[PDB]
Design a protein around this ligand. Structure first.
Ligand SMILES: CCCCCCCCCCCCCCCCCC(=O)OC[C@H](COP(=O)([O-])OCC(O)COP(=O)([O-])OC[C@@H](COC(=O)CCCCCCCCCCCCCCCCC)OC(=O)CCCCCCCCCCCCCCCCC)OC(=O)CCCCCCCCCCCCCCCCC
Ligand SMILES: CCCCCCCCCCCCCCCCCC(=O)OC[C@H](COP(=O)([O-])OCC(O)COP(=O)([O-])OC[C@@H](COC(=O)CCCCCCCCCCCCCCCCC)OC(=O)CCCCCCCCCCCCCCCCC)OC(=O)CCCCCCCCCCCCCCCCC
Ligand SMILES: CCCCCCCCCCCCCCCCCC(=O)OC[C@H](COP(=O)([O-])OCC(O)COP(=O)([O-])OC[C@@H](COC(=O)CCCCCCCCCCCCCCCCC)OC(=O)CCCCCCCCCCCCCCCCC)OC(=O)CCCCCCCCCCCCCCCCC
Ligand SMILES: CCCCCCCCCCCCCCCCCC(=O)OC[C@H](COP(=O)([O-])OCC(O)COP(=O)([O-])OC[C@@H](COC(=O)CCCCCCCCCCCCCCCCC)OC(=O)CCCCCCCCCCCCCCCCC)OC(=O)CCCCCCCCCCCCCCCCC
Ligand SMILES: CCCCCCCCCCCCCCCCCC(=O)OC[C@H](COP(=O)([O-])OCC(O)COP(=O)([O-])OC[C@@H](COC(=O)CCCCCCCCCCCCCCCCC)OC(=O)CCCCCCCCCCCCCCCCC)OC(=O)CCCCCCCCCCCCCCCCC
Ligand SMILES: CCCCCCCCCCCCCCCCCC(=O)OC[C@H](COP(=O)([O-])OCC[N+](C)(C)C)OC(=O)CCCCCCCCCCCCCCCCC
Ligand SMILES: CCCCCCCCCCCCCCCCCC(=O)OC[C@H](COP(=O)(O)OCCN)OC(=O)CCCCCCCCCCCCCCCCC
Ligand code: SF4
Ligand code: F3S
Ligand code: FES
Ligand SMILES: [Ca+2]
Lengths: 57, 103, 43, 62, 74, 196, 218, 285, 44
């Protein structure tokens, strides 16, 4: 259809676009994962201190 | 060689010979070898073939033996082409199914 | 004396030899990693 | 003590072997492979020996 | 030297069976059936696939001992 | 008994059919030498050789059901079975002679590798005792075999022409000193004169 | 990309993250040259005609694709230290034996083959065989050992799996180091309240299951 | 009492091979007391000498300077002059003196040939080397062990066998001049073995492969019109590599001092064997 | 072809003379089986 040169141009550009979308995903996931870990740790601390649960072993 | 090593070597070769002879001539082992040899001969010297010596007058040769090659070629070519067509049909079906399911 | 489908046998043997040699040597499917230093670049 | 009798320069196994063997061993290799290898290598390069750079080679970190 | 190359079949393997030519159609039928089965399986596996990447595709890892895999920051 | 019918029909067909060929196969085996008695069958044409070798065991072992056999048919089957048993024994004899031939050829091959020109690494001037003893015992066994074949002039002649060839070559490979008179004592009687 | 060799990470505050970057940048140029050679070979082969090329491009050039993937992953990792290999030994006891057969780390001698050859040499010496036979019987087991050692592309798959594991581990470790100061106070508070060393994620999943089971819906 | 000697034998073999390569063509002067002036008038013969009977003897060239103006110009004449005048311990076979018996076949200066009917390079500068037939075991000096050659000759049954009785017993087996000339140039072989000792296939496989001479004799007995065991002889020579090992080098016809052409005979035998193999299938049907 | 390779090895190598025609035939059968397997498998 198109010369091989244009096909490889398209391949490179598509690789870059996929990498950009992965960059968006990585940024959002890292931020929310840090927030999640903080929230879960705080929840476990509050639970143990409040006497709601006992965490042993 | 040294006669002590000579004794050892003679004993070892005698043991090897006896072991081989026993394993080959033992009843069940002998039967297994005897049947497998003939099976191998059949496979090697009587495998399916398309070319063979024709020693019969045209009046004494079956039609199967004049069109076997063509039948074989028809079967193989038809199988290949039909598999190709089935691959194309499956490609189209999968594309349509996953397209209609989303995007 | 006559051999049924002798020409078919000759061509089948030739094809078998050709295919076996092709796959064993991979004559047609060379490697070009050795030429990369001696090649121009685009983009 | 192994005593060997041998005409180094005239016996069939000697300098005549050096003159004969190399030019006969390489007959089919040269005359077949060289054209065949050239055809196999060049048929890819109908347009050129160009490496379509899929990675940013011209881009250098600041 | 003597010329020996040739594409002709050898007479040692050119014999027929008593009842006619060698079992060519009978074996070709088996070959075609086996090829049909094999290629059908391959096609069915190949074409009906998709990659679904989401949280439910991930499970907790474990050692060969069955315990949960965790590596310290040593 | 359908299975019995098929078993007996298969046995009859194979055994009787091969019995008409046993003469030809045995003659061909006799015609060749003892180095590879089945050479013609492996290289040129397998004239129902492997079939005979396989079905001899079946003729010896597999049972028969006379009620499925006729009178003349049963007599013919017994004759064919006896012929196949004869072929079994003949093949065993030929195998024994062939293996003895290969024993002698092994001795000769060791000597030849000893005197080979390429043998720059294992050149020995004087024959060692082990091979001398092997030669002596092999020649003793060969002489005993020749004696045991006194009632079969053709077999005796073939055994000489085939096996004694390598005995003669061994004779030629070594000098006539040391223990040579004792080693080839039996060979010097008649066989040595034959190979001149 | 022609990345510089001098890492821009602070070694005083993120030591491991600096070392990883330094090794990656050090080996990046060489691994990039190898990757470029492989990709050039792949595309030039794909440009072929009929059997010499396209007709069988994707399916028969498998070793090249495997090499390309291995090179890419190794380039991202940069360098591998024995501590991580021993760490992954949990799931693959033969990780070192597989990671040696994939990468040009150290020269491999067929020691088992040479030992078998020496045993055969002792046998021949006992039985007084010619020296040619024992030299051949020394070469043969060595040849068998070499044949069974080299190649072995399955080890490359196992190396790929290990390198994926190692990359994930290194990323998580870098995240640990980056936020270590932020979590110092919370960590100090947490160690004094929970006597368990089990991870927070596992404990929280267990707690969620406990709530989903016992807690009254109300 | 004896012990394993693989190591000592191996080291001795390697060292001896190296030294022999360094000291190949060892030469001992028969009469060292010769002024170099005298040697200008005398030609040099390097004669191979070896006496395996004597345990202290080893192979060696011996140099004899002889006046070629004292005996006729043939290799055998020079050898016998050396034997009678210089050293009568030299050993060689000789019966006919006119190239008929074929006993004197030797390696006359690089070519296998009968020594009685072969001249030698008259030039006084280039030395002449006389050695026994190459690949034959050496018994003493120029005498080799041709026993295997005769043993192979016996295996072809070289005697007229006929399956049809003579009609009257007072006549001779009829044979026209054409069926006789078919043998011309084929029955003159003197069994000298000079050709067969020059056939590489005979060098490699002396026993399994019959020599060019013996196969030529088999061809002579096959093409002969009076014998009736044509197919039987063809089949007998068709076993294993008794004939198939021939590679049509053609040295056999080049060396034959009698002018015979064993190469052509072997070629015809190969053609007849091929036809026999084909028509064993084509005819019986 | 195979026949020719075996013939060359027999005629040039003294050690190879040890093998019978039967062992040569067994090697022939194994080689044919391996060649058939190679041809079939490469296309799978
Ligand atoms: C314990 C037992 C003992 C063990 C011992 C150790 C060794 C193992 C032994 C085992 C026994 C079997 C060994 C294999 C067979 C060996 C045969 C041999 O050596 O013969 C030499 C011998 C050599 O003779 P030769 O004189 O040199 O001549 C050879 C020439 O090639 C002359 O050849 P030819 O000319 O006669 O041709 C042959 C013929 C042979 O082919 C056939 O007839 C056969 C067909 C295939 C049948 C397949 C059946 C398979 C069934 C399998 C079922 C399942 C099994 C599952 C088992 C599980 C376990 C129980 O070829 C063809 O038919 C050619 C077809 C070409 C088709 C072309 C298509 C054209 C398409 C286009 C159409 C037109 C379009 C026009 C468009 C126009 C547009 C303009 O060969 C022959 O003569 C026979 C022919 C070759 C047959 C090869 C068969 C190979 C089979 C390998 C099987 C491996 C299986 C492994 C399974 C593993 C499971 C774990
Ligand atoms: C398929 C899946 C399952 C496979 C299972 C295989 C099981 C094998 C077990 C073997 C056990 C030992 C057998 C000892 C012999 C006993 C039988 C006997 O003596 O012969 C009786 C009978 C007649 O023998 P005969 O009277 O001496 O005739 C020869 C004489 O020269 C007299 O000749 P004549 O001129 O008088 O004519 C008589 C004619 C009479 O012959 C016939 O009548 C037979 C004609 C064919 C069959 C006709 C019936 C078809 C329908 C059968 C339906 C069965 C339903 C079963 C249902 C079961 C339900 C539970 O004989 C022949 O023509 C012999 C044909 C030989 C064919 C050999 C095929 C070799 C190639 C095989 C692989 C091909 C792969 C190709 C792939 C290529 C891809 C490109 O011959 C046979 O039974 C033939 C059997 C041939 C195959 C056996 C070996 C197969 C090995 C396959 C390879 C597997 C490798 C796996 C790796 C290795 C480790 C596992
Ligand atoms: C992982 C994959 C595995 C599969 C693929 C394998 C591929 C690689 C190849 C492998 C090759 C090696 C195989 C292993 C060696 C086996 C050696 C052996 O059998 O040892 C016995 C042998 C003892 O027998 P013997 O000493 O020869 O005989 C004297 C005895 O006193 C006994 O005297 P008797 O008279 O009391 O009993 C005789 C007979 C039992 O007698 C009977 O009850 C009758 C048996 C059948 C006779 C034949 C009737 C044929 C009728 C026509 C059929 C047409 C079918 C449709 C086609 C029509 C168009 C052609 O018993 C046997 O000897 C059985 C031997 C095996 C079958 C022989 C029959 C071959 C022809 C029929 C089958 C093939 C189809 C041919 C179709 C074409 C025919 C023209 O030695 C042992 O006892 C050794 C035991 C330890 C080793 C393992 C034993 C395994 C046993 C397997 C039994 C299988 C039975 C058949 C199953 C069929 C299923 C469909
Ligand atoms: C890197 C990947 C891995 C590579 C290694 C893979 C190895 C796989 C396993 C190999 C197994 C081989 C043994 C089994 C086969 C049958 C052997 C046999 O007949 O057993 C008894 C036979 C002994 O018979 P015998 O009765 O003792 O000998 C007296 C008979 O008259 C003798 O009568 P004959 O005619 O029977 O004897 C001839 C004999 C040959 O035996 C001999 O008679 C003499 C052997 C030594 C010859 C040395 C050269 C002599 C001077 C020639 C001129 C050289 C000039 C060089 C400088 C040029 C400067 C411009 O022929 C053979 O050995 C047949 C097979 C030969 C090829 C296969 C073996 C290749 C080994 C390659 C590596 C060797 C080690 C490394 C060497 C380099 C280290 C820096 O063979 C042995 O027991 C020895 C086996 C070979 C040992 C190695 C010797 C060196 C060979 C070098 C060949 C190079 C070829 C070029 C390509 C190389 C590519 C790697
Ligand atoms: C660190 C790296 C180190 C690497 C190196 C390491 C060392 C490697 C190994 C080195 C040693 C190898 C030794 C091989 C010896 C082969 C026999 C020989 O020398 O020939 C004498 C002998 C001479 O016979 P002759 O009667 O004196 O000939 C005079 C006649 O006048 C002639 O009669 P005519 O004039 O009537 O003939 C007409 C002519 C008709 O032909 C012509 O006139 C010209 C034909 C030109 C063909 C051009 C093909 C082009 C496409 C392919 C190119 C590939 C390479 C290049 C790729 C890139 C460039 C394009 O016929 C021929 O040319 C016959 C031969 C050629 C047939 C065509 C097919 C050949 C290939 C067969 C398949 C090979 C598969 C290999 C798998 C290996 C697996 C390990 O020839 C034969 O034996 C013929 C059959 C040979 C079959 C060989 C099959 C393969 C064997 C594989 C196993 C070998 C194991 C060896 C021991 C290993 C160690 C223990
Ligand atoms: C990785 C390892 C690689 C190593 C490479 C080694 C290469 C080896 C090449 C060997 C070539 C062939 C000869 C050896 C094998 C022979 C096998 C065979 O069948 O032969 C048996 C026959 C010998 O046996 P025969 O003649 O007795 O025949 C057998 C006869 N019966 C059966 C009766 C006993 O042929 C030979 O061995 C011939 C040997 C010829 C040797 C020639 C040596 C030439 C040396 C040239 C040196 C040049 C130096 C130049 C320096 C320049 C400096 C400026
Ligand atoms: C000192 C060192 C010593 C070293 C010693 C080493 C010894 C090694 C000896 C073994 C190796 C030998 C290798 C020879 C080269 C390979 C040649 C080859 O590939 O063919 C093998 C054989 C035919 O070749 P060959 O038998 O040699 O010649 C016959 C001439 N009429 O082919 C066969 O018979 C194989 C069976 C298949 C043949 C082809 C069948 C027809 C092809 C079409 C099949 C179609 C199948 C169905 C359809 C598929 C496609 C749609
Ligand atoms: S073949 Fe030639 S060289 Fe040999 S004996 Fe006869 S005539 Fe003499
Ligand atoms: S010299 Fe040698 S191999 Fe054949 S034709 Fe002449 S004999
Ligand atoms: S001396 Fe008479 S033929 Fe040689
Ligand atoms: Ca006649």
């Amino acid at each position: 259809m198109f010369s091989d040169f244009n096909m490889y141009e398209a391949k490179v550009f598509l690789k870059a676009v996929a990498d950009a979308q992965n960059t968006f995903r990585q940024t959002a996931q890292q931020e929310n994962q840090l927030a999640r870990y903080e929230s879960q740790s705080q929840s476990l601390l509050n639970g143990s201190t409040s006497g709601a649960i006992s965490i042993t072993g | 060689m040294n006669h002590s090593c000579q004794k050892v070597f003679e004993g070892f070769v005698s043991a090897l010979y006896d072991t081989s002879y026993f394993f080959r001539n033992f009843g069940p082992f002998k039967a297994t070898i005897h049947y497998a040899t003939y099976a191998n001969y059949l496979a090697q010297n009587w495998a399916p073939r398309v070319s063979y010596i024709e020693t019969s007058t045209p009046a004494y040769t079956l039609a199967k033996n004049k069109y076997a090659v063509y039948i074989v070629y028809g079967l193989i070519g038809g199988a290949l082409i039909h598999n190709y067509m089935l691959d194309n049909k499956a490609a189209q079906k999968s594309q349509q199914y996953y397209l209609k399911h989303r995007d | 004396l006559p051999i049924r489908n002798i020409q078919f046998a000759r061509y089948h043997y030739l094809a078998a030899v050709t295919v076996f040699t092709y796959f064993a040597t991979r004559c047609c499917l060379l490697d070009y990693k050795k030429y990369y230093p001696l090649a121009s670049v685009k983009k | 003590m192994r005593r060997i009798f041998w005409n180094f320069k005239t016996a069939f196994v000697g300098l005549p072997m050096f003159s004969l063997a190399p030019k006969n061993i390489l007959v089919y290799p040269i005359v077949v492979g060289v054209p065949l290898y050239t055809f196999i290598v060049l048929q890819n390069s109908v347009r050129g020996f160009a490496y379509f750079d899929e990675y940013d080679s011209d881009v250098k970190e600041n | 030297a003597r010329l020996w190359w040739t594409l002709d079949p050898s007479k040692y393997y050119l014999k027929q069976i008593s009842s006619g030519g060698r079992n060519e159609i009978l074996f070709t039928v088996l070959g075609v059936t086996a090829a049909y089965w094999y290629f059908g399986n391959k096609r069915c596996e190949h074409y009906w696939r998709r990659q679904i990447d989401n949280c439910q595709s991930w499970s907790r890892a474990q050692n060969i001992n069955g315990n949960n895999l965790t590596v310290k920051q040593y | 008994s359908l299975v019995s019918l098929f078993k007996n029909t298969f046995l009859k067909s194979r055994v009787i059919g091969l019995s008409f060929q046993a003469q030809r196969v045995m003659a061909q085996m006799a015609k060749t030498d003892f180095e590879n008695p089945d050479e013609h069958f492996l290289l040129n044409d397998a004239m129902k050789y492997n079939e005979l070798v396989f079905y001899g065991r079946l003729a010896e072992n597999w049972s028969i059901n006379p009620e499925l056999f006729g009178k003349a048919e049963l007599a013919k089957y017994n004759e064919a079975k006896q012929t196949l048993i004869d072929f079994n024994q003949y093949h065993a004899l030929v195998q024994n002679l062939h293996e003895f031939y290969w024993e002698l050829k092994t001795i000769y091959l060791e000597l030849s590798r000893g005197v080979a020109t390429s043998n720059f690494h294992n050149k020995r001037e004087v024959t060692h005792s082990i091979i001398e003893s092997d030669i002596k015992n092999s020649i003793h066994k060969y002489i005993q075999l020749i004696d045991d074949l006194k009632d079969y002039p053709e077999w005796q002649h073939k055994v000489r022409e085939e096996i004694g060839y390598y005995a003669h070559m061994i004779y030629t490979s070594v000098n006539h000193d040391g223990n040579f008179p004792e080693i080839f004592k039996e060979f010097n009687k008649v066989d040595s004169l034959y190979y001149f | 990309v022609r990345l510089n060799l001098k890492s821009n990470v602070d070694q005083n505050e993120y030591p491991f993250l600096a070392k990883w970057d330094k090794d990656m940048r050090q080996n990046y140029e060489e691994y990039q040259n190898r990757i470029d050679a492989t990709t050039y070979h792949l595309q030039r082969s794909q440009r072929g005609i009929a059997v010499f090329g396209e007709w069988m491009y994707p399916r028969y050039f498998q070793k090249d694709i495997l090499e390309l993937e291995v090179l890419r992953r190794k380039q991202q990792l940069g360098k591998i230290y024995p501590e991580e290999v021993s760490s992954y030994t949990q799931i693959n006891p033969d990780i070192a034996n597989d990671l040696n057969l994939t990468f040009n780390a150290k020269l491999l001698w067929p020691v088992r083959g040479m030992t078998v050859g020496a045993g055969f040499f002792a046998f021949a010496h006992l039985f007084n065989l010619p020296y040619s036979f024992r030299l051949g019987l020394f070469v043969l087991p060595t040849a068998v050992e070499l044949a069974f050692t080299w190649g072995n592309k399955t080890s490359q798959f196992k190396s790929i799996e290990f390198m994926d594991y190692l990359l994930q581990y290194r990323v998580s470790k870098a995240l640990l180091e980056k936020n270590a100061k932020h979590f110092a106070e919370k960590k100090a508070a947490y160690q004094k309240e929970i006597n368990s060393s089990q991870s927070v994620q596992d404990l929280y999943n267990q707690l969620i299951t406990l709530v989903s089971e016992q807690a009254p819906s109300e | 009492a004896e012990s394993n000697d693989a190591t000592s034998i191996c080291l001795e073999s390697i060292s001896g091979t190296i030294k022999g390569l360094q000291k190949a063509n060892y030469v001992v002067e028969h009469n060292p007391n010769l002024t170099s002036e005298e040697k200008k008038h005398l030609k040099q013969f390097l004669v191979y000498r070896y006496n395996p009977a004597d345990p202290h003897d080893q192979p060696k060239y011996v140099s004899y300077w002889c006046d070629i103006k004292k005996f006729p110009p043939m290799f055998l004449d020079a050898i016998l002059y050396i034997k009678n005048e210089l050293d009568p311990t030299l050993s060689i076979r000789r019966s006919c003196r006119e190239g008929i018996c074929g006993s004197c076949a030797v390696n006359c200066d690089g070519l296998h040939t009968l020594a009685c009917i072969s001249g030698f390079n008259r030039d006084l500068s280039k030395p002449t080397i006389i050695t026994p037939l190459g690949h034959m075991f050496i018994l003493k000096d120029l005498v080799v062990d041709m026993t295997n050659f005769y043993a192979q000759y016996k295996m072809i049954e070289p005697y007229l066998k006929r399956k049809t009785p003579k009609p009257d017993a007072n006549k001779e087996y009829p044979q026209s001049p054409e069926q006789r000339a078919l043998l011309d140039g084929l029955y003159e072989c003197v069994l000298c073995a000079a050709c067969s000792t020059s056939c590489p296939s005979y060098w490699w496989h002396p026993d399994r492969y019959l020599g060019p001479a013996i196969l030529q004799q088999a061809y002579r007995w096959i093409v002969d019109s009076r014998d009736e065991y044509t197919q039987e002889r063809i089949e007998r020579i068709a076993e294993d590599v008794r004939l198939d090992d021939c590679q049509q080098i053609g040295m056999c016809s080049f060396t034959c001092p009698k002018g015979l052409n064993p190469q052509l005979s072997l070629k015809n035998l190969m053609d007849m064997v091929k036809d026999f193999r084909q028509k064993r299938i084509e005819q019986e049907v | 072809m195979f026949k020719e390779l075996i013939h060359i090895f027999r005629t040039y190598y003294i050690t190879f003379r040890y093998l019978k025609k039967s062992n040569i035939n067994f090697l022939k059968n194994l080689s044919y089986t391996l060649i058939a397997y190679y041809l079939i498998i490469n296309f799978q």
